[PDB]
Each structure stands twice: as structure tokens, then as C-alpha cells.
């Protein structure tokens, strides 16, 4: 099943504090109204990892207790074993079978009515883990950086494991205008590339556009093919 | 016959096509210069919205639009080429055509004016029908009728001249009106068109100038060298072409202040010479002023 | 008996202000000029960075002077661009300040006979208001509003004399002199010179003379 | 170089793209002007001298206009209510009843405090 993630996947791009500013950053966030893939575990197959993923879940029993991030997953690439009991984070390798058992390693670390959103990233070897626990609804909630890991590895495939409804996202490089409040948190956001009224809002750097006509961007027709010509079969 | 300029030609520039036409690494280094043509585009848009204010302050001095009645007994002027003829498809007046007769794409875009040549000539014929049929009283609200041999008598008594000149010599007025416009059939107006033309032409020919680098074309610099040293060569092209834009835009801002000073003078002459009689000496022509007639020459007005 | 017309309309028009396009534009244009200037301190202009401390303290002084020379040119062109926009924008404001000085002299410190200089209509009087970085003129003007239609002739020879007038007006059958205030036709504001072949379009009607009664 | 027919080179269709909107307190749907380009290149298609104007509807009537389009077209927001693209009306088409005997001054007055 596929569904519509309305305004989700908007996290804090930096640890800078800002208060009541309309800040425009060009960071990879989950686009608005994108295509997110609803799954049902009634199992948990392979997933595509491109530029990080927006995870989510909707459980009243806290049943998901595992992430396994690896290309080969046979104790060759650095996999992870994140568990939510505290978010205890085992970045070391365990010898997995075809399906790891429910009910020499490098790094170990300890830090109906619930959403568990888990935006991931891998830029400059800094494996970022964001989070938000908010009891896909019609609303808006920013995601705070929960932990960061300077592993410096390449990952391209993963599989969430439990001892039943987990969603995946698609992160793309996209301009985004943020809206901080008095409290220093994000209360609204605008993508400025989805529909023509949105990119008006970035050119004004505001939210309440007044009645008028605004030169938002420039139109250009890209070339289609190439035409290279040289004279008739002369020389021989 | 006074020829005043009103509006310049509206021009908007796109930087990433001008400086860095079909190049991505040029756009990346143009981004490294921060934000120079965000404000260049706001400078040129401020000029372009200003020209719409200039044309709408001079001609749109009245809310209504008055029609010349189908019987036209307006004292006898050469109003066939003055008042509009229904023969021309793109409707103007032949006097406006006489002034029309006498007067590319490399990122530069010549945006059209809002107030078209037919709509300006409808404003002007409303001012002509307002002046003839209603005099000065059409400047308060709508038109409030006045006969022609009553309004020029009152245009005598308002400048201390006795009212016994056009009341006795009307055939002198209609013949001298034919002869003086006959002498006419545009120094200030052709100047404004020419200065805009040389400004854009020097801007285009700057792309043939290498600014001390190896070449003035984008692709040869990219093919011959590599991001070690092409980086230095393309920096000369960008900072050469960016100074060419700032030179052009600064010359456009100074030239738009000149045209706005002549647009406030043409708005003052429309108010005080057309919508009324001026007591000011040598403001609405040499001599004792009776009344004026607006004539919508291209990018200007002829009083 | 029309100070009650004025006071209500003066209170309604000050209410319609309560219920600033030129002035708020001036405040905003200065703000964007200053804000673009400060954001130029985050531009590289081709250098490694924009904070002057790390250009000095990341690499050797041999080529640090070259890199800071590129940075100082970008900052100086940004400062020259800001100054030449302030000089042009101050010439615009000085044209508005000389127009406000002319309106103070001719509309407040006197009455202007100029048409549509101190407001639409027959200008009566102005009041300046000391607005932020500007001035608000309450142009009290005499505007007649709801239109009419009379009937008049170029001159009126009564018994052989062409008059030069004040406006001959007539509601449909009788002639009034005139603001729409029908007053009696009198030779006080019309003076006699000529004849009724000496003004084209002339019709024949009475002219009340004040020496007779 | 192969045959001897002479063929021109005219540049690709570029231009600006402007967004015509009411207030966000008023409406949410917008029109999209494409400046200068005839719009066989690029919702309700509408061609003007300014360029293509998609997303708004042509209206044969004429009103005192609100949002400047360009080249004698203006946009507004009304009939539910949508965005309409019409030729600007220039004011009421009054006809003055001028005669050889006619004068006019308006009846009452407003002491207008401009």
C-alpha cells in the first residue's frame, strides 16, 4: 500500500538556535505529499536506501525493536542493532542468519497512540539519527536530533525487525523554508518547489503573500538531442 | 508644440543566462558570489513598475472616458487626424501615427507596457473630448459640459486678456493650427529611444570581450582547460561580465530618474494646461496661454 | 451651515485612514539595502571562506594575502554598490522633499490656484501631518459632485451689445450666473464691448442691469 | 555541410515565469504567467501578448482591473469564485451631451478632505 505523507520529515538542519525567523536552507528533507510505502507484517522485506529514509510506525504495543543497516549483512559491512526498550544502540556486528532470531564486533553505545519517526542520514561519514514521538495525521511536528554517530561507512540497504506497520520515505535534495517560533522550535514549513504559490513564498521569504504578481523564477527550454553534420562520403 | 518624454522601455535581465549561458559550473561559481543579482533584478523591477506609474499619472488624469459626439462642431480645428479615425485597425490617430512613423535575446527580455497604444489614445481622446466639451470642469469629477466659444472666452479672461480675440478671429486659429502642425509633419523622443538602444548594444557586445582571459566564449575555456586552471579563467569572465551588468543597471537607474522628472513635468502640464488654464508665464508655451491638447506620441506626449 | 458638512467629512476621512504606501515603501527599501550588505559578510567571492580568522589560521601567509585580496575586492564592490544606491535614492527623496516644501508654501502657507496640485477639485486649504519620515497633507478641497446640465450661449446680446463675462448658466428656460450657485445675471461681472456679429454662435436674451432698479 | 540549403538559428524559448495570486487570506489557487513565450511550448491555456497565462480563465467582459498582467490584460479574483483574465476597462464610457447651448456644474458639493 502507498499513502500520502502530507507535511512530514521536516527536522532541524543544524544545532544553531534561532527564534521567530523565516530561515531558508537547502538540505535534503522528505518532500511534501510524497509517495511513502506502507507495509504490513502479516513480513519485513528489503528496502531501498538512497539518501536516508523517513521511518515511521503506529503501534500501541512498542513491538518493533530492531534496525539492521548493511550492504552484505554477513559481518562484513558495519551493521547496526538499534533497540528501543532507552535507545540502546549496538553498532557492532552479530552473525545473522536469513531471518535474525527474535523474542568480533566493533562499537557499542547506550543513550494506536504513538508515532515513531526516525529520519536517517549519511553525509560526511556522520550517521545522523533524528526522532519524534508524537501521540500519518493532519499536523506538523519537527524532528529533533536524537543521536549522531561518526561511523564513516557506506550503507545502502536495511531491514527493520521485530519480535507491524512500518513506512519508508524518499529523501531528495530540495530547498525548504522553515518557520521558527518564539520558543526556538519549528512551527511551520514550506517546500517552495511543490506548487507555484510555494516558490512565491521563498522569493518573498514570507508566509502571507499579498495580492499581486511576483517574478518567482525563470523559464528555460532544455535541449532535446544533438545534430552533428559533416560533408558527403567525399574522401575514401 | 512641446515634446515631453514619459516612459522608458521596460527591460528585465536574467543573470544565469547572461553570464553563464548553458553552463552549470559557471552557475556554481556565480552562487559563490553570494547574492548580487537578486538585488539587480529588484533594481530593474523597480524601474519597470515605475514606468507604469509614469504612464498612468500623465494620461489617466480622469476616471471616465468621454466620447466625441457624432456631430462634431468643435470650432473647426484639424481634428480628423487629431481625434481618432475608425479606418485604422490598430486604432490610433494619424497625428499619433505621424509621431509613430518618425520614431536581441541574450538574457535580456523586453517586457511590454501595460497601457497599450490603443488604450493610451483612448485616454488622450477622452482628454481632448473633455477639454473641448467640458473645459476645465472635467478635472473635478466627471465631465461637466461647456461650449467651445464659451470656454475659450473664459480662457481669455483667466489670463488678463480680453475675451475678444478668438471671439473675433476663429478662422485665424484653425488656419494657424493647420499650418503649424503642417510645419511639424522629435528631438527629445528619438533621443530616449536611442540611449536605450546603445545601452543594450554595449551590454551584448561585452560578451565578445575576454577581460584578460584566454577566450570570451564559455565552451572553449571548459574544453581546453580543467577545474585546476579553468577556475581562474572563468573567474575573469564572471567578474568582467558582472561589472558590465552593474554598470548597465546603474546607468538605467540614473536615466529612469531623468524620465520621471520629465513625467512629473508632463503630469503637471496635463493638470495645469489641459485640465485648466495656467497663469504661470512660459510654463505652457511662450505667450499668453489659452488651452493645450495632449497628443500621445510613442513613449511620450505632445502638448 | 456646511461646517457640519466639513466636520463630518473631515471625521469620516480621518476615519477612512483609520479603517501609507509611499512612506512604508521608503522604510522597507532602506531595510533591504542594509540587509543585503550584512549578508555579503557570508559570501566567499572566490576565497576559501568568509570569516577572516580562518583564512589567516588555516594556511600559510605566502598565499593568504592573495586570497584575502580577492575577499577585500568583493567587500569593497559590495560597499560601493550600497553607496551608489543611497545616492540615487536620496535624489528621489529630495525631489519629494522639494515637492513637500512647495506644497507647504503654496497649499498651507497660502492658496494655490493651480489645478490638481493640492488635491482634486477646487483647492480650499491643506493641513500637514508630521508623519514618520514624511508629511501627510489633509487637502481640504471644494469638490462639487453630483452632475447637472444647463444651456448657454457664447455671448448674450440684449439690445445690440456683446458681453464678456463668472459663467452664464441656464436651467432650461431662464439664465443664471455662477460652484453651482444660480445668481442673477448682472453687468457687474460682464462688461460690454462689441456687437453680436463679433462673437460667433451668439443668441439673444435679457441681461438684468443693476442701475435700473 | 551535406546539402546546400541555408537554415537559420533562433534561440530556445526562454523567459520569466510570474505567479498571479490573490492574498493568502483570500484564496489559495494561483495563475502562472509565462513571460514572452508562446505557449505551444508550455489548468486552462490562454495566450496573450505578455505570454502564456495558464491556470486562469478568459472573460470577454471588462472591469476596472486589480492585478497587472501586461499588454492590456489584467487579472482579478471573482466568479465558485476563480481567477479571471480580462481586458482592462479604462473607466465608464460616458457620453457628454455637448450642445451650442449647454453648461454644467455639479449640484451639491462634498468638502473633500483628500
Instruction: Estimate the helix proportion of chain A, in percent.
Output: under 10%
Work out the largest interface and the residue count of each chain: B-C, 45 and 48 residues
Number of helices of chain A: 1
Largest sheet of chain A: 4 strands, antiparallel
Strand order within the widest beta sheet of chain A: 1-3-15-5
Question: Quick gist of this model?
Answer:
The PDB classes it as viral protein/immune system. This is part of a larger assembly, with four copies of chain A. The first copy, chain A, is mainly beta and about 240 residues long.
Tell me about this structure:
This is part of a larger assembly, with four copies of chain A. By secondary structure, chain A is mainly beta. Chain A is built from one helix and 18 strands. Chain A has one helix at residues 196-204, and strands spanning 2-5, 24-29, 34-38, 47-48, 56-57, 64-69, 81-84, 87-90, 108-110, 116-117, 120-123, 126-133, 144-149, 157-162, 166-168, 172-180, 186-190, 212-220. In chain A, the strands form five sheets. A four-stranded antiparallel sheet of chain A has the order 1-3-15-5, with no helix packed on it. In chain A, strands 10, 11, 12 and 13 form a four-stranded antiparallel sheet that branches. In chain A, strand 11 and strand 12 form a beta hairpin. The longest helix of chain A has 9 residues, at 196-204. Chain A starts with a strand and ends in a 16-residue tail after the last strand. Chains in contact: A-B, A-D, B-C, B-D, C-D. Strand 3 of chain B pairs parallel with strand 8 of chain D, so a sheet runs across the interface. Chain A: Disulfide bonds join 92-105, 192-202. Chain A: Residues 1-204 form the BetaCoV S1-NTD domain. Chain A: It comes from Severe acute respiratory syndrome coronavirus 2 (2019-nCoV). Chain A: Glycans are attached at residues 35, 85, 104, 154, 183, 224, 226, 232. Chain A: Residues 181-202 are annotated as: Putative superantigen.
Amino acid at each position: 500500500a502507498y499513502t500520502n505523507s502530507f507535511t512530514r520529515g521536516v527536522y532541524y538542519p543544524d544545532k544553531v538556535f534561532r527564534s521567530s525567523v523565516l530561515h531558508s536552507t537547502q538540505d535534503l528533507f522528505l518532500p511534501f505529499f510524497s509517495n511513502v510505502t506502507w507495509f504490513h507484517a502479516i513480513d519485513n522485506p528489503v528496502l531501498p536506501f538512497n539518501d536516508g529514509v523517513y521511518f515511521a510506525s503506529t503501534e500501541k504495543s512498542n513491538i518493533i525493536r530492531g534496525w539492521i543497516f548493511g550492504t552484505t549483512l554477513d559481518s562484513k559491512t558495519q551493521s547496526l542493532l538499534i533497540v528501543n526498550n532507552n535507545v540502546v544502540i549496538k553498532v557492532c556486528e552479530f552473525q545473522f542468519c536469513n531471518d535474525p532470531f527474535l523474542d568480533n564486533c566493533t562499537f557499542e553505545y547506550v543513550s494506536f497512540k504513538n508515532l515513531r519517526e526516525f529520519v536517517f542520514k549519511n553525509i560526511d561519514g556522520y550517521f545522523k539519527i533524528y526522532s519524534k514521538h508524537t501521540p500519518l495525521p493532519q499536523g506538523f511536528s519537527a524532528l529533533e536530533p536524537l543521536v549522531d554517530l561518526p561511523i564513516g561507512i557506506n550503507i545502502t540497504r536495511f531491514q527493520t525487525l521485530l519480535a507491524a506497520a512500518y513506512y519508508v520515505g524518499y529523501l531528495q535534495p530540495r530547498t525548504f523554508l522553515l518557520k521558527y517560533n518564539e520558543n526556538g522550535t519549528i512551527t511551520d514549513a514550506v517546500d517552495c518547489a511543490l506548487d507555484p504559490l510555494s516558490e512565491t513564498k521563498c522569493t518573498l521569504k514570507s508566509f502571507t503573500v499579498e495580492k499581486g504578481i511576483y517574478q518567482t523564477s525563470n523559464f528555460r527550454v532544455q535541449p532535446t538531442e544533438s545534430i552533428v553534420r559533416f560533408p558527403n562520403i567525399t574522401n575514401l | 508644440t512641446e515634446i515631453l518624454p514619459v516612459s522608458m522601455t521596460k527591460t528585465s535581465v536574467d543573470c544565469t543566462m547572461y553570464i553563464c549561458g548553458d553552463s552549470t559550473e559557471c552557475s556554481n561559481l556565480l552562487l559563490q558570489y553570494g547574492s548580487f543579482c537578486t538585488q539587480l533584478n529588484r533594481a530593474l523591477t523597480g524601474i519597470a513598475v515605475e514606468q507604469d506609474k509614469n504612464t498612468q499619472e500623465v494620461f489617466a488624469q480622469v476616471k471616465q472616458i468621454y466620447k466625441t459626439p457624432p456631430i462634431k462642431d468643435f470650432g473647426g480645428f484639424n481634428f480628423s487626424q487629431i481625434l481618432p479615425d475608425p479606418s485604422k485597425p490598430s486604432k490610433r490617430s494619424f497625428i499619433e501615427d505621424l509621431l509613430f512613423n518618425k520614431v536581441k535575446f541574450n538574457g535580456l527580455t523586453v517586457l511590454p507596457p501595460l497601457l497599450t497604444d490603443e488604450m493610451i489614445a483612448q485616454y488622450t481622446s477622452a482628454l481632448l473630448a473633455g477639454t473641448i466639451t467640458s473645459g476645465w470642469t472635467f478635472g473635478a469629477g466627471a465631465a461637466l459640459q461647456i461650449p467651445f466659444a464659451m470656454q475659450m472666452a473664459y480662457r481669455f479672461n483667466g489670463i488678463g486678456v480680453t475675451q475678444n480675440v478668438l471671439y473675433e478671429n476663429q478662422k485665424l486659429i484653425a488656419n494657424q493650427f493647420n499650418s503649424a502642425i503642417g510645419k511639424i509633419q522629435l528631438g527629445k523622443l528619438q533621443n530616449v529611444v536611442n540611449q536605450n538602444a546603445q545601452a543594450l548594444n554595449t551590454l551584448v557586445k561585452q560578451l565578445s570581450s575576454n577581460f584578460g582571459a584566454i577566450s570570451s566564449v564559455l565552451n572553449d575555456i571548459l574544453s581546453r582547460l580543467d577545474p585546476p586552471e579553468a577556475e581562474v579563467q572563468i573567474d575573469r569572465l564572471i567578474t568582467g561580465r558582472l561589472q558590465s551588468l552593474q554598470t548597465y543597471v546603474t546607468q538605467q537607474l540614473i536615466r529612469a530618474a531623468e524620465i520621471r522628472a520629465s513625467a512629473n513635468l508632463a503630469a503637471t502640464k496635463m493638470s495645469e494646461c489641459v485640465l485648466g488654464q495656467s497663469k504661470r508665464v512660459d510654463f505652457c508655451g511662450k505667450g499668453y496661454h489659452l488651452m493645450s491638447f495632449p497628443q500621445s506620441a510613442p513613449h511620450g506626449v505632445v502638448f | 451651515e456646511n461646517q457640519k458638512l466639513i466636520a463630518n467629512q473631515f471625521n469620516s476621512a480621518i476615519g477612512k485612514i483609520q479603517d501609507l504606501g509611499k512612506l512604508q515603501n521608503v522604510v522597507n527599501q532602506n531595510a533591504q539595502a542594509l540587509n543585503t550588505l550584512v549578508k555579503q559578510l557570508s559570501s566567499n567571492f572566490g576565497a576559501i571562506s568568509s570569516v577572516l580568522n580562518d583564512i589567516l589560521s588555516r594556511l600559510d601567509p605566502p598565499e593568504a594575502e592573495v586570497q584575502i585580496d580577492r575577499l577585500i575586492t568583493g567587500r569593497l564592490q559590495s560597499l560601493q554598490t550600497y553607496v551608489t544606491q543611497q545616492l540615487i535614492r536620496a535624489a528621489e527623496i529630495r525631489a519629494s522633499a522639494n515637492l513637500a516644501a512647495t506644497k507647504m508654501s503654496e497649499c498651507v502657507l497660502g492658496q494655490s490656484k493651480r489645478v490638481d496640485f493640492c488635491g482634486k477639485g477646487y483647492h480650499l486649504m491643506s493641513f500637514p501631518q508630521s508623519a514618520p519620515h514624511g508629511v501627510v497633507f489633509l487637502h481640504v478641497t471644494y469638490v462639487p459632485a453630483q452632475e447637472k446640465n444647463f444651456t448657454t450661449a457664447p455671448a448674450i446680446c440684449h439690445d445690440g451689445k456683446a458681453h464678456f463675462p463668472g459663467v452664464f448658466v441656464s436651467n432650461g428656460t431662464h439664465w443664471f450666473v455662477t460652484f453651482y450657485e444660480p445668481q442673477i445675471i448682472t453687468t457687474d461681472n460682464t462688461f460690454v464691448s462689441g456687437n453680436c456679429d463679433v462673437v460667433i454662435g451668439i443668441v439673444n436674451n435679457t441681461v438684468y442691469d443693476p442701475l435700473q432698479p | 555541410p551535406q546539402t546546400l540549403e541555408i537554415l537559420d538559428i533562433t534561440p530556445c524559448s526562454f523567459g520569466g515565469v510570474s505567479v498571479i495570486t490573490p492574498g493568502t487570506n483570500t484564496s489559495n489557487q494561483v495563475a502562472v504567467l509565462y513571460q514572452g513565450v508562446n505557449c505551444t511550448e508550455v489548468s486552462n491555456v490562454f495566450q496573450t501578448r505578455a505570454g502564456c497565462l495558464i491556470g486562469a480563465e478568459h472573460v470577454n467582459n471588462s472591469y476596472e482591473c486589480d492585478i497587472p498582467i501586461g499588454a492590456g490584460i489584467c487579472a482579478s479574483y471573482q466568479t465558485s469564485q476563480s481567477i479571471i483574465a480580462y481586458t482592462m476597462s479604462l473607466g465608464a464610457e460616458n457620453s457628454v451631451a455637448y450642445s451650442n447651448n449647454s453648461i454644467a456644474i455639479p449640484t451639491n458639493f462634498t468638502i473633500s478632505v483628500t
